[PDB]
Amino acid sequence: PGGVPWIAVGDETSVTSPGALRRMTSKDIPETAIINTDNSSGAVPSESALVPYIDEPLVVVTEHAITNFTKAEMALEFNREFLDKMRVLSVSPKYSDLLTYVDCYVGVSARQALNNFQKQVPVITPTRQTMYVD
Amino acid sequence: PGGVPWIAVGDETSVTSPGALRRMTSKDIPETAIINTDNSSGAVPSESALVPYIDEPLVVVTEHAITNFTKAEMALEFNREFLDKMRVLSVSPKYSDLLTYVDCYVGVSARQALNNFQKQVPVITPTRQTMYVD
Amino acid sequence: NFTKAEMALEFNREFLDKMRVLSVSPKYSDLLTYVDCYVGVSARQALNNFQKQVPVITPTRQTMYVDSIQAALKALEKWEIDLRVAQTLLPTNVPIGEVSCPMQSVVKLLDDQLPDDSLIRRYPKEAAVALAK
Amino acid sequence: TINVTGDGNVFKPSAETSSTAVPSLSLSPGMLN
Amino acid sequence: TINVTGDGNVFKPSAETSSTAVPSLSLSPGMLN
Amino acid sequence: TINVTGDGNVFKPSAETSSTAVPSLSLSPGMLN
Amino acid sequence: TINVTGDGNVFKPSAETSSTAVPSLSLSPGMLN
């Protein structure tokens, strides 16, 4: 679908409740934080002292977004024979590797996510998402 | 009646002097604090991050005022056919819900409120009151 | 697409509730129905097509839903001008890189040049979160 | 519950955080069937 | 549901059935408190 | 089975029942692979 | 592995094997979110 992950801090008896949805953060899901990203493609460093170590917001990629980026990848592999000659990007990014699946409340606002629970929602961080298009 | 809900400080039923009381506050009666209010009509937000958690004074409504404010709602209902077309205010506020009936000493001074105990006194907070008239 | 139309609304959720309009979100998928029969345009090709979990709706229900989107936008015809105006009053975007400026200072200019009838002045908190969203 | 003219806020426009909400969707009559 | 143009309706105003919705109602502050 | 010259038929054009079949399709080669 | 200057290769351009790799694709903001 779309939107942003949300977590509950009060019983969701009825929709339109005065509270009880909170923005998620990579501190909630340590998987989606930049210390655990697979360093395939070798972007994030290997030296310990240079890693931001700060939690960040999480964002849901839409279903349609996945399709277009994965296509955008396919253009690169048309030159794999030439690319390895330059020795650049010795692995396929596989945009799916960057995503994680989690079933929670997703939505542009708390109010409309509150009614909208979802199942196996792909999520990304604005940092990590940037590391890919970069 | 009318006035402000006064509480007994110290012990239960130890009220003997006007200096042994205190104005109540939404901390004391948490039902009248805006993380609890029935959000019918969708007034207060649903972000857990935009909510005061700050208590406010309590005021007493008068029996001849609820009759007036209920009829205030009756003006809209002569147009609900258009409202639901206009898609506004899907559930009529029903002022009585926002009220809460607690019983205590009620008055507009600790002295005279001492001599004035009552049972089943409706109460409201000024912030919630502004929401309804709005 | 249609479930993206409602997402256009809730960018101003922090203002619709200020307006008591559409007090609970539309949730287009709820109106749908999931059945499984032969689906198509003509019989002699629907006879070759059997699908599951087919989303079926009713034109009256379908008509009703798009109005909820439509009727919602109307109230915000004037509000969305302000946010567009509030942003373009000063550089809030760059082609590249980063720019910085104290937040007290900028909001003083907004207090200084915004039109007198701006809803931004009249609802600073909602405009604050609506911007940051 | 936030201070508009208080401190603590940050105003750092960037390329990666360029604003947009919903310009246009693809609602072709052929596409929607 | 109801057909405006068709027959079977009635326009028979009567002083027993005058028309008022909510012309006004009292809000006097001293008697609200 | 239907008398195109017979009565009982209905002709009420309206904006809700606009006339489209499939004017254009989205077959951009980049987006097809 | 392949001899460019050798024999055996085939050069029959055809209308069904039109050459085209990846011109562009939908990246517009609204329908991307």
Side-chain angles (χ1 to χ4, degrees), chain A residues 62 64, chain C residues 1-9 11, chain D residues 21-29 31-32, chain G residues 28-33:
Chain A
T62 77
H64 200 96
Chain C
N1 285 254
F2 268 97
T3 59
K4 266 184 196 40
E6 41 176 348
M7 271 176 238
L9 263 51
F11 292 100
Chain D
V22 168
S24 51
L25 279 298
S26 188
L27 291 93
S28 162
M31 181 146 187
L32 300 158
Chain G
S28 53
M31 61 80 71
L32 195 44
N33 284 66

Side-chain angles (χ1 to χ4, degrees), chain C residues 79 82-83 86 110 114 117-128 131:
Chain C
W79 154 268
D82 263 8
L83 291 73
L110 294 174
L114 282 177
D117 58 38
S118 170
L119 302 154
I120 304 312
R121 330 166 57 95
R122 183 177 293 171
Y123 297 108
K125 325 291 179 172
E126 309 77 342
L131 288 156

